[PDB]
Paper text:
In mitochondria, mRNAs are polyadenylated by mtPAP. In our work, we purified an active form of chicken mtPAP and determined the crystal structures of the mature wild-type (WT) enzyme (residues 37–568) alone and in complex with ATPγS, UTP, GTP and CTP substrates to 1.82–3.1 Å resolution. The purified mtPAP crystallized as a dimer as observed in solution. mtPAP consisted of an N-terminal domain (NTD: 52–194 aa) and (using the domain nomenclature of the DNA Pol β family) of palm (195–341 aa) and fingers (342–527 aa) domains. The palm domain is composed of three α-helices (α6–α8) and a mixed five-stranded β-sheet core (β5–β6–β8–β9–β10) that forms one wall of the active site and harbors the catalytic triad conserved in all members of the Pol β family: D237, located at the base of β6; D239 on strand β6; and D319, which belongs to β10.
Author numbering:
A (entry chain B): 52 to 126, 131 to 527
B (entry chain A): 52 to 247, 254 to 527
């Protein structure tokens, strides 16, 4: 039910899953028939990534060890044994060419130039936005692949750090991730002995000889450094390992070839996890939330408002928060404020970080459904109108209050960090970039207000969402 | 027990051993009583190294995992440690106010030998040169406890390598295992880390990352282990990575044991050399007595040094001593070719095309009929090399003969396991001449002294007379 319960279930399924690089001439039935001899298979799919790969989700974890028991070491290699397998035929020239294999599950979304025609063939702006959402959103197969990537990194980390867990956060889990997005991973340490340890009969407290480091930051940097070097030199399918240990949140970036994901590994950050669960709640509350976010992120990218590299540009996160604020301010609100979510929280949902109460309700059924019935056609235009006429000089965005309030500090765009006091999430944004955003918003509002959609359809020209998803 | 069988047994015992940093107020009985609840303990001892530490050797390996299952990270330590779990434990009292046993002193096992200034008086009170040399040997040689500690150090380093090379081994060589090591000597360690089912309709293999060329692989693996030694455990390690040397090397101080260590990738020739020396050391007690005394002599007179350079090495010196013993009438030890001829098929070892075989079973070697005393052998060693023609002759330990020098080098000692290689190529003419001068002077001192009067006069005599600066 809850965000935490979804993560637990996803990780358990990943724990009994494996990846297989398939033979050039793949017979699906023969492969599955063989794998089923090691135990029942709950789920599986194929994907393309420099050849065909299969994700296999066994019903029982024991099946993994069963398969590993008949798997050999190639024959010079780093003999780290994993859940990455390569299957080939003994006598490849004695099997014929295969007629109709296999269904491929896409791990990327269609490019904008292919999307636009689909949008133009839609009946309304609402339908356009749902088409975009369906084309872009993470698939069940992609999600399974993301959790398996985390599970594999966990196993790699567990060689030196047996209590390691690796769990995804951000776009991979908050409902706003699009196909192709990075897998952001958090490493944490928790006792694998989940069972109830007795009262020991002896007199001693017993610990490992470990250096007590002055800061959590230094420990984090040393741990990530070793894991990074090990992935680089010893880990199968890990490439382009970049150590970015001196960043605000120390980080190791890498490309995971078996899955084709770009990944980012850091040590667990409690604030970042609260943020992911908050966005998950908002995304789950109403489908218009996700529809708006996906369309507006695409809009921002198309018009050069967002960028892949950090700088003076508004970030996708900042933009997403602006959208949440917009939705909080509808009459009636489409989503509750963070203070409203805090007040619905019981003792079990108490989360205090750095002295600041970051509590909010985890049970979605405790949130009264919105009575707002505005269509996406209205909301898209109104978003552009609202921020196109928003006084950014005088007002800041407070998502806890759901109100425009005086700016604590002078900054072009001030959006309050909802889990840290006196922090602006959009402090990076300069006046030029903010003015560009405003100009694009106003132009987009005008285009939607003035267009004759029926004639554009007849004239075979872009209309509605498509009209604002092309350069001006 | 062959050399190989000794190593195997030692490593197996180290594999089921742990190190425990003991409570400030240590009750030995309570500690052992508690630890025995995880399984029987075959051996244990205590040593001093910034507080009391205990080596615990469990009867069963399973006991290690049992102890680890109740070992925890403090709440205050969370997020502030590198969570590498090891066989290094710290024990403290749950309630410091719950001591309810009589306090007894704990026996400390020494890991160092007495300094020369304390040794000399003991030598001067001996009855003969032979007795002096056996006193030195007994004061200096590795103890059973020290040996266990050395193998455990290797075992701990092995566990770092095994994270991604599960079949890895780390084994000591050189002075730690060849019978000629003295307390306080480095632990020289070799890593061997790579190249060590039902049939379905698919061939099935793991996806594994390729290693680079042997040297590059060696450099990367040693670099990571060096980083582990830095960051895993209590640390304070003084890790020196010397990865660009001819033989890539990591030097470090292992704080839990207090050993100075050198880690490199396994060299098959160096291992044969260690077993050869082990054979020679085991054959006759005079072999070890001579080597220990002469190594001490070399150090005292500045002929050997802790850092590599133009100095004769302890290994080269030891080989010179072996050559000397091969040349006695009759020989005290056999030549390497004699040991080769005694080898059966099971003792076959060919390295780089060169037959490095020799007998491993010591009972197959006929005991020496030489009955020369150490008094004679010590003086004769100095006399022999003091008059040896180093310009014209080289030392061949396979033949047990002086032979023409293959290449021009001040001191030429044939590498017994590699063709056309001089183990003492590093030695320059100045250092060789110093050695010769010291040898000749030492011979004269022993030849001319009146030992009875020196004893009465309370002056150094015999071995003591050559173990002080000239
Ligand atoms: Cl194949
Ligand atoms: Cl997030
Ligand atoms: Cl996008
Ligand atoms: Cl040796």
């Amino acid at each position: 039910k809850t965000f935490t319960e979804v993560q637990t279930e996803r990780l358990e399924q990943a724990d009994r899953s494996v990846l297989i690089k398939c033979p050039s001439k793949l017979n699906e039935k023969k492969l599955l028939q063989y794998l089923s001899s090691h135990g029942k298979i709950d789920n599986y799919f194929f994907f393309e990534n420099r050849g065909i790969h299969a994700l296999i989700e066994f019903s029982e974890k024991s099946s993994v060890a069963s398969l590993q028991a008949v798997t050999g070491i190639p024959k010079h290699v780093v003999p780290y044994k994993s859940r990455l397998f390569t299957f080939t035929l003994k006598n490849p020239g004695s099997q014929a060419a295969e007629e109709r294999p296999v269904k491929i599950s896409p791990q990327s979304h269609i490019p904008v130039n292919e999307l636009i025609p689909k949008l133009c063939h839609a009946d309304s702006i609402s339908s356009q936005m749902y088409i975009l959402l369906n084309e872009y959103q993470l698939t069940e197969e992609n999600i399974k692949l993301r959790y398996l990537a985390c599970s594999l990194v966990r196993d790699f980390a567990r060689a030196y750090f047996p209590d390691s867990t690796v769990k995804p956060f951000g776009s991979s889990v908050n409902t706003f991730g699009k196909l192709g997005c990075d897998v952001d991973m958090f490493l944490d340490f928790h006792d694998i002995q989940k069972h109830a340890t007795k009262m020991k009969k002896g007199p001693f407290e017993m610990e490992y000889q470990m250096k007590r480091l002055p800061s959590e930051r230094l420990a984090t940097q040393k741990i990530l450094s070793i894991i990074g070097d090990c992935l680089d030199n010893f880990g199968p399918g890990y490439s382009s390992v970049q150590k970015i240990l001196n960043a605000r949140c120390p980080l190791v970036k890498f490309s995971h070839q078996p899955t084709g994901f770009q990944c980012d590994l850091s040590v667990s950050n409690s604030i970042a996890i609260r943020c992911s669960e908050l966005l998950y709640i908002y995304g789950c509350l109403d489908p218009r939330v996700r529809a708006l976010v996906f369309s507006l992120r695409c809009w921002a990218r198309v018009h050069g408002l967002t960028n892949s590299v950090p700088g003076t540009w508004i970030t996708n996160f900042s933009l997403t928060m602006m959208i949440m604020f917009f939705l909080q301010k509808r009459s009636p609100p489409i989503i509750p404020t963070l203070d409203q979510l805090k007040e619905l929280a019981d003792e079990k949902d108490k989360h205090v970080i750095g002295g600041y109460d970051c509590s909010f309700v985890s049970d979605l059924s405790k949130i009264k459904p919105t009575k707002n019935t505005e269509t996406l056609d209205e909301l898209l235009c109104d978003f552009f109108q609202y921020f196109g006429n928003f006084d950014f000089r005088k007002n800041s965005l407070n998502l806890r209050k759901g109100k425009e309030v005086n700016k604590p500090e002078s900054s072009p765009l001030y959006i309050w960090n909802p889990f840290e006091q006196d922090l602006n999430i959009s402090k990076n944004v300069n006046q030029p970039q903010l003015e560009k955003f405003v100009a694009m918003a106003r132009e987009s509002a005008w285009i939607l207000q003035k267009e004759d959609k029926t004639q554009q359809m007849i004239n075979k020209e872009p209309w509605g969402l498509a009209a604002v998803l092309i350069p001006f």
